[PDB]
């Protein structure tokens, strides 16, 4: 167990067992049953891994836009720019998305159900590489960077994934009330840190600041 | 009149007799634990059917059940 979420006098019940990114945070006791805990673990993994590859598309692409090197659109209308484009693969996108996902999501599903259970002659000659070392941690995928003894670098992945999920939640909450993008909000907030603040946009009470 | 029955489910608490208002049922030999009595209905010409004996019987389920039948001068509680 790594440091606790509350520094003082908040005893965990079932989070004394070892697990990646365990800071003893479970106020609602949603992971008491070990099987459901084992499921929610993969839940975190798939959410974090997905939000990180998403926030990078919002962060690293808009930093060049503000500097002026590239003229890409903001994400709150990047979806609207696509289909008006001349060569536009129109919205047969969603359904082919669902098909192409489903085929893989079901494999991951049945692997979580029967861990590392891939038939011998099921997939052409690559059945062998599809067996995963652990749940949510497959072998054949990472080419280098996994054959070390200090395998507990998964802490970095989990902390960055949680930070990126918070990042995308903040992006969706900002681009909804601030009207501007994340980089633009950051730059205006560095310009004048006392006026551009969530208190002026998001809460209904302080809008009656009539002296 | 009122067909009264007494099943084997009984402990002989002597309560459905000190509660009956018409002195209809008796308690003669039974092989019990401490008291050893069982209720019986030898006569029914005076039973009115008030179901006061069914309220005091603590047996589960009740030991006595009054099968409601036909009415008469005694069964209708008629002083006239």
């Amino acid at each position: 167990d790594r440091p606790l979420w509350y520094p003082g006098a908040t005893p965990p019940a079932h989070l004394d067992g070892s697990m990646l990114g365990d800071y003893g945070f479970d106020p609602l006791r949603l992971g008491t049953n070990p099987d459901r805990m084992k499921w929610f673990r993969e839940a975190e993994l798939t959410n974090g891994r997905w939000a990180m590859a998403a926030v990078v598309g919002i962060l690293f692409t808009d930093v060049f836009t503000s500097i002026g090197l590239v003229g890409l659109p903001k994400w709150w209308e990047a979806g609207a720019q696509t289909y008006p484009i001349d060569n536009q693969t129109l919205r047969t996108l969603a359904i082919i998305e669902f098909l192409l996902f489903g085929w893989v999501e079901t494999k991951r599903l049945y692997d979580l159900r029967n861990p590392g259970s891939q038939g011998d002659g099921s997939f052409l000659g690559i059945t062998d590489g599809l067996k995963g070392t652990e749940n949510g941690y497959p072998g054949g995928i990472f080419d280098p960077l996994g054959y070390s003894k200090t395998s507990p670098e998964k802490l970095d992945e989990l902390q960055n994934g949680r930070l990126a999920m918070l990042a995308f939640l903040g992006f969706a909450s900002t681009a909804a009330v601030n009207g501007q993008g994340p980089i633009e909000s950051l730059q205006t907030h560095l310009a004048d840190p006392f006026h551009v603040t969530f208190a002026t946009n998001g809460v209904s009470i302080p809008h009656f600041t009539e002296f | 009149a009122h067909v009264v029955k007494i099943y084997d489910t009984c402990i002989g608490c002597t309560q459905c007799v000190r509660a009956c208002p018409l002195d209809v049922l008796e308690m003669v030999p039974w092989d019990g634990c401490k008291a050893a009595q069982m209720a019986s209905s030898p006569r029914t010409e005076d039973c009115v059917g008030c179901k006061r004996c069914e309220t005091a019987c603590p047996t589960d389920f009740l030991s006595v059940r009054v099968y409601l039948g036909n009415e008469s001068t005694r069964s209708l509680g008629l002083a006239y």
Binding site: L90, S122, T127 | -
Partner: protein, 195 residues
């Protein structure tokens, strides 16, 4: 015997062990009783054979250029005599239906009275005059072959009617539409398939 799993790593179903074309499919756990599974396999084989015939005919009509599979009986409303390769068969509407009813009645009634649980599925004698089933090893293989090829024809024929219902175009015409611009001419761009 077992040819594969529908989902790799799926937990096997003990109902289907000794069956031909075993893919461990039945997910709703039907045919679990030992009696119903026989009828259901008659259903498979017979539907497969009928389908394969229907799909072959639908494809042949358009491949040889005689017309549409949907416009096949449709002459019955205009009145023009039916045609098989433009030979213009002369029979009327009622005669066709009557002969169909009587012939199907006779054939189906004869088929039903077999009461040989293994021949109700795979008849013999006159139905395979060439004697392909005499070899035991090739017989199992051809069984699997017809089962698969008829499971395709069954899905194809439903794709035939499903395609025609959303877009009236014929089979080869819709195929050419799709092969012309794949990403644009699809089933989500129909406006009727997915709401």
């Amino acid at each position: 015997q077992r040819a594969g799993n529908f989902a790799p790593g799926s937990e096997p179903k003990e109902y289907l062990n000794d069956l031909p074309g075993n893919f461990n499919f039945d997910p709703l756990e039907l045919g679990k009783e030992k009696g119903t599974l026989q009828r259901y396999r008659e259903a498979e084989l017979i539907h497969c054979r009928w389908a394969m015939l229907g799909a072959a005919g639908c494809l042949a009509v358009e491949v040889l250029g005689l017309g549409n599979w949907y416009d096949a009986p449709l002459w019955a409303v205009t009145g023009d005599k039916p045609t098989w390769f433009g030979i213009e068969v002369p029979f009327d509407i009622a005669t066709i239906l009557g002969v169909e009813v009587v012939a199907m009645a006779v054939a189906e009634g004869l088929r039903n009275d077999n009461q040989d649980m293994e021949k109700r599925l795979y008849p013999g004698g006159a139905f395979d005059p060439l004697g392909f089933s005499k070899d035991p090893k090739s017989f199992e293989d051809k069984k699997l072959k017809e089962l698969k090829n008829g499971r395709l024809a069954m899905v194809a024929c439903l794709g035939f009617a499903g395609q025609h219902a959303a877009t009236g175009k014929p089979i080869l015409a819709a195929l050419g539409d799709h092969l012309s611009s794949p990403f644009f001419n699809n089933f989500a761009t129909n406006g009727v398939s997915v709401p």
